Symmetry: D2
Subunit: 290 residues, 4 copies
């Protein structure tokens, strides 16, 4: 479980009220599984097994009750509280101890990636010795995000957190890879005009040093919107349509743990049975008939 | 004085694992509010204001922080734990002291009704002096529910829980009205068919006494299925389609309390003020204007 | 004594939906399991109207006629007339003059989809009104798209404006209208608006101004499904699918309504189903003869 | 010069009655464009510009009415009728003249493919000099399709058309690529157990010659189902959720021709004119901007 990642799963939850009044947004379903399974799955697909989950004072213990130490899936999971949703970059101040002196990835708890050859897409980022990697994705509402501006060739030259005058239609996704300098940069940030510690500031620091890779995530990939009540419906439908057409599950941690050898046949079987009244447990057991 | 209702909102949620490993089914979002808002709504539209909410040990506290004592919306809410999901009929045993010598309605925490004239459809039931009333609804999969059989003249002649060979296509819905006899009937129920104290055995006792009304819920009403992950997507999409077209909400308790005179403008406004930062409050606040 | 004749206006440019509607007429598009026009047709039937005139474009009108025929298979009588250009809703009544004759009329738009409990009882006063006109008001969130009716402190209709910039309310006028025999001449006496369209809203205002306009409230318990955009099309189809799959019934099945209302008998239905017995629609037709 | 392909857009469409009673299935919308736009886009993306569209006596003239000779898209489109749906392989018998001595692809008119690097997966199959390529895709209901049987090493070893007992969950999709040998093989076919002249039989012949590439289409690709009223809606929601998140269209032919250099900026603006009053024209127009 040598390689490291962080899932930032807290947040004010204000926008979705009152759905999020007694439930962390990141415990909400997306079709047939809790939302956090998706980003967890992404980290696992990047070959990352040592993972810190950050959420609220109220909700962190809920994530721990759900997933425990992660050993049942061949992972090492730990937990820590963010007292207040002070910014994406706080991930790294809170995860200081967890990070030690290693590389680290950060994925937002509500980011849902899907599409062919993702693991390979992430491959260079995971293998990069120094610097950082982020991914850029074309959307119709860039204002909402960190916006990456491109050269008359395809070279990134500027980032902006939520620009009134977006300079491109490319948003930076909520998946990030860093070397070990990120902790110190985070520790040096002052909040922004939005009153947040902005991961955009960190990315610009790496950019200004000429150490930022910005990889393009083409239109062939889905990077699902999860901001509104309506977008949540759409994210679930999308997953449902994939799974029911293929007879396969998207971002199922037990399967991914199995396929990658984190856990064996006897393990899957044991995880499958309590879940076997429905399709989820039956799908997992059947995977095992090898 | 206040009429009395129970919302049974626990269960184990096996059928929805692993979603329900994480969160109470009756806290899953149905578009823009928790599921329990829809059944609460329903009791309210019937004029029932003194409501007991029964959930699990782990979940009750969470329904408590979500809803509070109800005074804010002009209701009186109280709570009780059901240690084990030993059947719908146990609601009356748990609620025996709440109920006293009064009539009581039972609505399932997962029952979503929508349609024109719902309060009229429930009026006879609310005002029945002796006996019980249930509602029948035509489904394509009768075998999953309690099923009511009629004779050629439309008389309820039989009621069978999850029959092998359904005698009709009419299911019994999750809304029930009882006189004060139901408490003693419950206390005598026997773990018949499957480990739970069944609502159909209660109902079967009223039928045999000639005291069960079966009101027909026509096809113009919607009774949203929350049974599977796919049906929960549909419930949500169904509500969203109504609301987005109308610019109005379905089963917004605060709205309803206001339209019925449970609370007045000033209360609505006092509710909205702290919520105006989000779309829900914005909706509350416009209420008090048009 | 008059009867009430029916008109379905299923014309229009269709530009908003290009190029879907370069291949297919909007009102032939599927709403889940049947052509869109089946809905508003079904609405007339539920109101008891069996004699119906369908108006559509020159290009599209023969397609509707391939689909529906003369209506007799469902105990209806359907006729067809062409609207050369989408010059306005109220032209429907100029085009249908020879059809309406001296009777009462009901016009429903080809893309209007109504669903909910006691719909027919909602239309009843309108159907039985002897003189004047009846429209239906529905609270929407984008009133600027429709004719908007303004109500006074007492809830009394007080004005109507077409696609106004500053709506005086959130109540739209529904795409289903009921009229006595006065409407044809009113329509023939209309001058086109600034935007160049013979407006039905100007007809309703006239009736309004005469004191002969009933405006009936279609409550939030009813659904009035949007078909203006591709995205509202998928939602209409998803809305119907969810109803139909939960119930094992069908929304707006002309055959069924004809049967239930006595327009045709069990044998006619079986005669309809046989040829169709290998598809799911036929299977439904046939099961309703059974039990 | 121009590479060739066939779109087989026939069949009764009987199981969709009455939706298909006065419309060809393959003219039904999927979200914002007719169904046939999809597989047409597929061939385009494969570098195939000379295309034969096959359909029924009644529907063929409707396709020719919508698309014309395709030169407004920088293509060559022609048409031919299939009197009766007596087999997919009939495509090559009806298209013998149009094929001549060249390679030919075939795509089914109701097939919708999407995903990251799809053009690359198609370009390998077009590159191929001798033999044939099909694609295998994991699905829920294989018995509806041609089914592939694999080794313990994962080598494709056998094929069966709609097996009662499927040997795997891997179906053959409706996209195929052949060298010029496919026409003689189709001319030698005899009707199978079912009514029909099977493409599966030709594929088996290539497989047994050691000349069939069975290209695996990973679970990251979508291959949407158009077989029921419900699958259509599903395929439309999928497409719509993708386009509205990205502000980009899926399988817009005019866009593909432009991006691939089939047509220039001027020809795009001309295409935009008749569509200019809606989002679809605007999208084409905006691409000649920025
Ligand atoms: C701003 C912020 C967001 N979040 C989470 C909530 C979402 O998963 C994600 C994005 O937040 P928003 O969605 O930008 O509030 O990050 C935190 O956990 N802590 C923070 O300080
Ligand atoms: C270039 C282009 C690709 N596509 C589709 C084809 C493939 O399904 C997908 C390829 O995306 P990709 O760059 O991420 O591989 O996008 C279009 O629909 N329109 C276009 O103009
Ligand atoms: C059986 C049972 C269900 N419930 C709630 C959850 C279910 O959605 C609903 C009906 O349960 P059911 O699955 O047996 O029909 O009632 C309880 O709160 N306690 C119970 O003992
Ligand atoms: C009788 C009948 C009604 N309807 C519709 C009209 C209304 O929208 C709704 C009325 O349902 P209701 O029985 O609850 O009043 O059902 C059909 O779609 N098919 C039918 O066969
Ligand atoms: C203006 C007009 C609209 N229509 C149809 C097209 C639309 O479906 C509907 C509403 O038109 P608008 O809504 O006035 O464009 O009525 C015609 O059939 N004829 C007409 O002259
Ligand atoms: C009175 C009231 C009803 N409702 C719901 C209950 C019904 O299912 C629906 C139909 O109303 P109608 O009976 O006015 O059509 O509206 C609210 O959501 N809020 C309210 O204030
Ligand atoms: C058998 C056959 C199918 N088709 C079309 C109809 C369907 O869209 C598709 C697949 O049909 P299938 O499952 O029966 O093979 O091919 C033809 O156009 N011609 C034919 O000869
Ligand atoms: C191995 C594995 C992949 N995936 C996902 C990750 C990517 O989104 C996509 C990659 O598919 P691919 O095989 O076509 O490249 O599939 C799962 O959801 N579960 C799994 O067990």
């Amino acid at each position: 479980k040598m390689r490291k990642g962080i899932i930032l799963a807290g947040g004010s939850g204000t926008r979705l009220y009152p759905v999020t009044m007694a439930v962390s947004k990141q415990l909400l379903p997306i079709y047939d599984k809790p939302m956090i399974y998706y980003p967890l799955s992404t980290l696992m697909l990047a070959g990352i097994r040592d993972i810190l989950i950050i959420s609220t004072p109220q909700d962190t213990p809920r994530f721990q009750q759900l997933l425990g130490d992660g050993s049942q899936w061949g992972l090492n999971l730990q937990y820590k509280v963010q007292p207040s949703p002070d910014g994406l970059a706080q991930a790294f101040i809170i995860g200081e101890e967890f990070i030690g002196a290693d590389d680290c990835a950060l994925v937002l708890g509500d980011n849902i990636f899907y599409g062919h050859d993702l693991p390979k897409l992430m491959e260079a980022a995971v293998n990069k010795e120094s610097g950082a990697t982020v991914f850029a994705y074309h959307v119709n509402d860039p204002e909402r995000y960190g916006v990456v501006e491109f050269d008359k060739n395809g070279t990134a030259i500027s980032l902006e957190e939520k620009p009134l005058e977006p300079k491109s239609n490319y948003a930076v996704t909520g998946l990030y890879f860093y070397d070990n300098d990120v902790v110190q940069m985070a520790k040096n940030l002052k909040p922004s005009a939005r009153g947040e510690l902005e991961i955009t500031d960190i990315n610009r620091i790496y950019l200004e040093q000429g150490r930022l890779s910005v990889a393009l995530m083409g239109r062939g990939y889905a990077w699902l919107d999860t901001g509104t009540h309506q977008s949540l419906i759409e994210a679930s439908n999308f997953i449902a349509t994939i799974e029911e057409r293929q007879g396969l599950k998207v971002s199922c941690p037990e399967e991914i743990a199995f396929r990658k050898g984190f856990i064996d046949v006897e393990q899957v079987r044991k995880l499958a049975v309590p879940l076997i009244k429905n399709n989820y447990g039956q799908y997992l057991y059947k995977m095992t008939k090898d």
